[PDB]
């Protein structure tokens, strides 16, 4: 830590001052009876603000909870600390991003109302994001606005219903194929039974979730062979009988869009 002059008061021959976390906060010099307060030297997290790698390799770094005055103190890498790019934010001091006065809709959230984005040659800007367009509704005590037309707007809403059923064997996961370890683990009472009960409850609850969401009709209605629905066209959402799966065009699109390139089903 760092040592500094202290405005504290001590006993005639007191020694030091501890704090809440059982860490010494101040100390009296043994040689000369002078008191120093111990403040740990600067530390904090590091966040790297970047666009996509294909977009650019330029990055900006945010030293969280830190004014950049201790960046010259430790002046591992030090490439971007040349200066003229230092910006002070309430989320820490930002290095490598230009500050601009105007406002835009947020692209990369930094904190305390500051966002970063890649704009025009090309550089990373840091701005106080705008909450939205201004608007003064023409209110009057005798004026009204009435729609003379309309639009029919369809919007999507994706909701997760269930998740993957996983059941584990506690003993096998811990030390499968080990009699000595099986006997030793048996001394821990019923922990594996508790874990298996919890995971089985989750697995059954997944089926309950799916049933509650979907099985709300006891009769499987089907549309008539004549699609005379007043001109409305439901082909994209009605099932397509040609495919082996009796699901619609949009359903195929969704099932193809959801990718499991991670270890989800690759470990099948």
């Amino acid at each position: 830590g760092v040592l500094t002059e202290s405005n504290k008061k001590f006993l005639p021959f007191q020694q030091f001052g501890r704090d809440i976390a059982d860490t010494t906060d101040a100390v009296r010099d043994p040689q000369t009876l002078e008191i120093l307060d111990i403040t740990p030297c600067s530390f904090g997290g590091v966040s790297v603000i970047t666009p996509g790698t294909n977009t650019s390799n330029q990055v900006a770094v945010l030293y969280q909870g830190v004014n950049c005055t201790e960046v010259p103190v430790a002046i591992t890498w030090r490439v971007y600390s040349t200066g003229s790019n230092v910006f002070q934010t309430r989320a820490g001091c930002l290095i490598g991003a230009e500050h601009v006065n105007n406002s835009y809709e947020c692209d990369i959230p930094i904190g305390a109302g500051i966002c970063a984005s890649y704009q025009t040659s090309q550089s990373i800007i840091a701005y106080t994001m705008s909450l939205g367009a201004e608007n003064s509704v023409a209110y009057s005590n005798n004026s009204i606005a009435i729609p003379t037309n309309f639009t029919i707007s369809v919007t999507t809403e994706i909701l997760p219903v269930s998740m993957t059923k996983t059941s584990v064997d506690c003993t096998m996961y811990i030390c499968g194929d080990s009699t000595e370890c099986s006997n030793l683990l048996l001394q821990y009472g019923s922990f594996c039974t508790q874990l298996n009960r919890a995971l089985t409850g989750i697995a059954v609850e997944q089926d309950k979730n799916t049933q509650e969401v979907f099985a709300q009709v006891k009769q499987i209605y089907k549309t008539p062979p004549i699609k005379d629905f007043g001109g409305f066209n439901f082909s994209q959402i009605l099932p397509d009988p040609s495919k082996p799966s009796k699901r619609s065009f949009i359903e195929d699109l969704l099932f193809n869009k959801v990718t499991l390139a991670d270890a989800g089903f690759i470990k099948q």
């Binding site: 009204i144 009435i146 029919i152 996961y173 080990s178 919890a198 949009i250 989800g264």
Partner: protein, 250 residues
């Protein structure tokens, strides 16, 4: 068509609007459906919720697997290697260290899965409520079944999830009008039975609140209550009783 007229009456728009703009509404709905299919095909990040759920489950499982390769303070992370190198009375310490580490990993994984399952159960309860109140009905709740005045909804199956196509009625082309709370005809106050009084500059009409369909002010469009001097903002205008010219011709 009659179902959609029922929905229009549900949102406060007279069914004559649908019966006169059926072709336009069908075209708009078909265009919206095509736009949805294009967006779902070309977005590549639309199913973010389901993708995140799958990624979280996979990441938790891989973390649980990788925890099998940690010493947890023991001589080695391989139980067979520990057993071969050490005789059982001293090997029990290493085996117990591994047992504690692996059991702690299992407990952490199970607690995380319980919390995530609670989250998924909340989302599934929301999805069931949305199914019941949008697919099986017409919800008056604002922003529940999409933005705008909800009309009807379509469910679509998704991997470990559900997709709702919320069809809504959005007012589009506004126009300014001069309005009054009531009308003075013969010392009486006429309030709109179902609609709003609007002036196009020189004449006073009665219009439904959600669509400009001006109509002449009559005794059918309005009800009488009180006198003129009490209502703040009342205006003088003629209220035409259809029975009076009929008995004039009589």
């Amino acid at each position: 068509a009659m179902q959609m007229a029922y929905r229009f009456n549900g949102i406060g728009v007279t069914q004559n609007v649908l019966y006169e703009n059926q072709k336009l509404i069908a075209n708009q709905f078909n265009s919206a459906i095509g736009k949805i299919q294009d967006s779902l095909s070309s977005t590549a990040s639309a199913l973010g919720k389901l993708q995140d759920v799958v990624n979280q489950n996979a990441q938790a499982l891989n973390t649980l697997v990788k925890q099998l390769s940690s010493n947890f303070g023991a001589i080695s992370s391989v139980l067979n290697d520990i057993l071969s190198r050490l005789d059982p009375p001293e090997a029990e310490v290493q085996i117990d260290r591994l047992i504690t580490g692996r059991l702690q990993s299992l407990q952490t994984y199970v607690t995380q899965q319980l919390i995530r399952a609670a989250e998924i159960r909340a989302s599934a309860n929301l999805a069931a409520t949305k199914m019941s109140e949008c697919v099986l009905g017409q919800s008056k709740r604002v922003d529940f079944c999409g933005k705008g005045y909800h009309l009807m909804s379509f469910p679509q199956s998704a991997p470990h999830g559900v997709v709702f196509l919320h069809v809504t009625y959005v007012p589009a082309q506004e126009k300014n009008f001069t309005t009054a709370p009531a009308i003075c005809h013969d010392g009486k106050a006429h309030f709109p039975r179902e609609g709003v009084f609007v002036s196009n500059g020189t004449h006073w009409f009665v219009t439904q609140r959600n669509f400009y369909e001006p109509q002449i002010i009559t005794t059918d469009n309005t009800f009488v209550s009180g006198n003129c001097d009490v209502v703040i903002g009342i205006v003088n205008n003629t209220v035409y009783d259809p029975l009076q010219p009929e008995l004039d011709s009589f």
